[PDB]
From a paper:
Recently, a shortened Dscam ([name]) gene family with tandemly arrayed 5′ cassettes in [name] species has been identified, which encodes ∼50–100 isoforms.
We found that [name] alone but not FNIII1 or FNIII3 could promote cKIT tyrosine phosphorylation, suggesting the essential role of [name] domain in mediating [name] cis interactions.
Numbering used by the authors: 387 to 491
């Protein structure tokens, strides 16, 4: 039946931009991985040395490439990593490999 995309978003980058904010950018999964229409993404992040689950934010697909998300309100002097997955109507696909960045002032 209907199922989620079968590949991860691509070219994920994470840039510290100061004020405890990270700038996350990424591109869609390979077109042949979409298994339908991409409706949006979930961006997950956590502290690199935490055994907690990733914390996620849902973002709608924009008409722009790459996609961009600012993650602000982070803690001082900690290091984070970020993952992204795409979703279609059915569900969310696999996640990108984490990309790491420090929350810088």
């Amino acid at each position: 039946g209907a199922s989620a995309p079968i590949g991860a978003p691509t070219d994920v980058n994470v840039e510290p931009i100061g004020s405890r904010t990270l700038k996350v950018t990424w591109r869609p999964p390979l077109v042949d991985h979409w298994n339908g229409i991409i409706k949006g993404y979930y961006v997950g992040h956590k502290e690199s040395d935490s055994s907690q689950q990733y914390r996620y934010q849902r973002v709608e697909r924009s008409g722009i490439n790459p996609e961009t998300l600012l993650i602000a309100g982070l803690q001082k002097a900690k290091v984070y990593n970020v993952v992204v997955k795409a979703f279609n109507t059915a569900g969310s696909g696999p996640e990108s490999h984490p990309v790491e960045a420090y929350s810088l002032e």
